[PDB]
C-alpha cells in the first residue's frame, strides 16, 4: 500500500528481455538486469542495464533447464560495482538453472551468494513467462529473502504483476478498484484541474494519495476547487490540507499525505518518488520540468494536464475568446518526455522567472515572446480535461479502447473549435534520456538547487 517494494522495468528493456527469453525454440534462456535503487518509504529497483547470455554459449538449454557461463555473471558484478547496483538474474518460465564455470557448476543459491560477494547490495532472481508477466525474489546478504511485491512495466499499456496474484479485470470493475488500492498516486497541483483529479483518484479507491501544493484556498478559487468552503477561504487553508481532510472524511481513513510545499523541493521530489503514478496539474513551466525529471529518474508513469482559454480583441466585436483548449500528455519511462514535446522549454522557464521590469524590457528587445491574454479559468473546462486525464490512466491499466493506447500518447481538444486531435508516440522525436532510472543521484534530479551538497 505504502511500504510495498517495487521492481520497475522500462518497456524497452522488458521487450528486449522478453524476446531473448522466448525466442521460439520452446527452451530456456537467461539474462541479467543491473538496477539502481530508491529507498524512501518503499524500496524500488530501477532497471538500468540488461545483459543477455547467448544461447550458443549455454550448455543444457532444455525446456525446463539451462546452464550458462559464469563470465556473464562476472560482467554484471563489475557493471554494478561503482554504484553497488543491484543485480537481478532472469530466466524463462520454469526458471531452473546453474551457472557453470571453469572449475565447477554452481546452483541457484550458490550464484546469488557469489553475486553478493561481488557487490554489497540487495540482489534477486526473477522468472518471466511467455506473456511477459514477471515474478521475482530478493536475496539479502546473498540469502533467500523477501519476495518482490510488485513487478511493473509502465509502457503504452501499464502492467502490474503482483506476487499475491496467481483473469485480468476489465475496466471499472472491482478488480480495477483492488489494483488501485495497492498503488500510490501523487497529485502535483491541487487547484482547479488537480482538485478534480484528486477527487477522482480518491473515489476510484487509491490506497495512498500524495498532495503537493504551496498555495491556499481563497475567495477567488471557490469557483473551481472541489471540497473548498467559504470558511476555508476566510482562513486561507492550505489547499493540500483542505483536500487531505476531505479525502479523510470521504474514505473514512487518513490515506492522504499533504505536502504544503512546491514540487521544486527535496521534500516533494522524494515523496513523489514513492508514487506509482504522477498526476501533474500545475500551472508553471518550471513545475512541469520537475515532474518530468522525477518521472524519468524513478521510472514513474506521468500524466500531465493543462488547459487554456486564450482571448483576443476582435476589430469590430471587441474582446473575444480565441479558443477553449485542453491538453493531456501521457509520458512513459523511456518514451518521449514533456521536454521532447516542448511542453516546457528553456526560454519559457526563463521568461516565467523574469520579474516585472525584466519581462517588459526583454519583450521590447524581441528576445522573449509575448504572453497571450486569457479568460478566467472555469470549472467546466477543468473538469473536461481532468476527467480525460484519469480516464487515460484507467485505459492504459485496463485497455478498453478499440485502438492501441500508443495512438493517444497526446490529446488536444478544442471546445471552441469542436475538435480533438491525437498524437502517436511514434511521431514524437526523443532526445537521450540521461535521467532514466537515475534515482536520487546527486544533484537530485540533476538540479543543483535541490542538491544535498
Amino acid at each position: 500500500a505504502s511500504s510495498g517494494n517495487r521492481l520497475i522495468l522500462t518497456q524497452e528493456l522488458h521487450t528486449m528481455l522478453q524476446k531473448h527469453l522466448f525466442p521460439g525454440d520452446g527452451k530456456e534462456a537467461a539474462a541479467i538486469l543491473i538496477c539502481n535503487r530508491y529507498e524512501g518509504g518503499r524500496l524500488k529497483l530501477l532497471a538500468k542495464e540488461l545483459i543477455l547470455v547467448p544461447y550458443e554459449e549455454c550448455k543444457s538449454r532444455t525446456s525446463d533447464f539451462i546452464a550458462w557461463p559464469g563470465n556473464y555473471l562476472e560482467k554484471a558484478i563489475d557493471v554494478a560495482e561503482e554504484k553497488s547496483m543491484s543485480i537481478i538474474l532472469i530466466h524463462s518460465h520454469p526458471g531452473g538453472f546453474l551457472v557453470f564455470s571453469d572449475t565447477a557448476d554452481s546452483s541457484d543459491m550458490q550464484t546469488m551468494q557469489s553475486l553478493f560477494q561481488g557487490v554489497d547490495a540487495i540482489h534477486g532472481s526473477a522468472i518471466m513467462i511467455h506473456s511477459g508477466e514477471m515474478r521475482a525474489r530478493l536475496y539479502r546478504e546473498g540469502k533467500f529473502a523477501e519476495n518482490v511485491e510488485l513487478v511493473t512495466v509502465a509502457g503504452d499499456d501499464i502492467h502490474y504483476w503482483w506476487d499475491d496474484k496467481t483473469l485480468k479485470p476489465i475496466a471499472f470493475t472491482s478488480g480495477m478498484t483492488d489494483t488501485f488500492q495497492k498503488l500510490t498516486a501523487a497529485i502535483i497541483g491541487v487547484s482547479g484541474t488537480g482538485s478534480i483529479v484528486a477527487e477522482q483518484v480518491a473515489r476510484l479507491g487509491f490506497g495512498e494519495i500524495l498532495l503537493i501544493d504551496h498555495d491556499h484556498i481563497e475567495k477567488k478559487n471557490l469557483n473551481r476547487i472541489l471540497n473548498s468552503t467559504l470558511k476555508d477561504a476566510l482562513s486561507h487553508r492550505p489547499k493540500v490540507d483542505m483536500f487531505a481532510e476531505a479525502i479523510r472524511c470521504i474514505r473514512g481513513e487518513d490515506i492522504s499525505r499533504p505536502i504544503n510545499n512546491t514540487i521544486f523541493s527535496r521534500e516533494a521530489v522524494l515523496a513523489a518518488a514513492n508514487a506509482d503514478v504522477l498526476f501533474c496539474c500545475v500551472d508553471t513551466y518550471l513545475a512541469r520540468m520537475i515532474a518530468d525529471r522525477i518521472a524519468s529518474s524513478f521510472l514513474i508513469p506521468l500524466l500531465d494536464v493543462g488547459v487554456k482559454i486564450p482571448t483576443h480583441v476582435d476589430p469590430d466585436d471587441g474582446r473575444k475568446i480565441t479558443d477553449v483548449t485542453g491538453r493531456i500528455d501521457y509520458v512513459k519511462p523511456g518514451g518521449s518526455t514533456l521536454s521532447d514535446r516542448l511542453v516546457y522549454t528553456p526560454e519559457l522557464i526563463y521568461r516565467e522567472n523574469l520579474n516585472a521590469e525584466e519581462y517588459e524590457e526583454q519583450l521590447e528587445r524581441g528576445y522573449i515572446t509575448g504572453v497571450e491574454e486569457e479568460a478566467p479559468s472555469v470549472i467546466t473546462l477543468n473538469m473536461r480535461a481532468a476527467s480525460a486525464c484519469v480516464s487515460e490512466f484507467i485505459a492504459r491499466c485496463f485497455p478498453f479502447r478499440e485502438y492501441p493506447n500508443k495512438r493517444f500518447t497526446r490529446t488536444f481538444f478544442s471546445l471552441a473549435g469542436v475538435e480533438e486531435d491525437y498524437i502517436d508516440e511514434s511521431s514524437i522525436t526523443q532526445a537521450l534520456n540521461t535521467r532514466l532510472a537515475v534515482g536520487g543521484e546527486e544533484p537530485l534530479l540533476g538540479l543543483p538547487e535541490l542538491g544535498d551538497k
Binding site: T193, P315, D323, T325
Partner: protein
C-alpha cells in the same frame, strides 16, 4: 473579392492570395504569439502552415484558417 474564415469569422480580402500573417492580423490575432496555424480544405485533412506562408483563397473547398494555442499549461 475572396473571403477566408478566421477563427470562425469570415473576413473579406481584396487580393486572391493573402499571407497568413496578414489574415491573422485582420482577425485581431497576434501573429508573433505562439500558435499552431492550421488550414482546412473540404475533402482533405488539416495541414499545418507557417505565419508567413501565403494562401490562395481561390482554392476550392477552403474552410477555415484556425489557430490553436501552442502552449497549454494552466492548472
Amino acid at each position: 473579392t475572396w473571403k477566408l474564415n478566421i477563427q470562425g469569422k469570415e473576413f473579406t480580402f481584396d487580393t486572391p492570395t493573402v499571407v497568413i500573417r496578414d489574415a491573422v492580423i485582420r482577425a485581431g490575432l497576434n501573429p508573433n504569439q505562439a500558435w499552431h496555424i492550421f488550414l482546412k480544405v473540404e475533402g482533405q485533412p488539416k495541414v499545418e502552415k507557417n505565419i508567413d506562408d501565403v494562401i490562395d483563397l481561390r482554392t476550392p473547398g477552403i474552410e477555415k484558417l484556425r489557430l490553436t494555442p501552442k502552449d497549454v499549461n494552466n492548472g
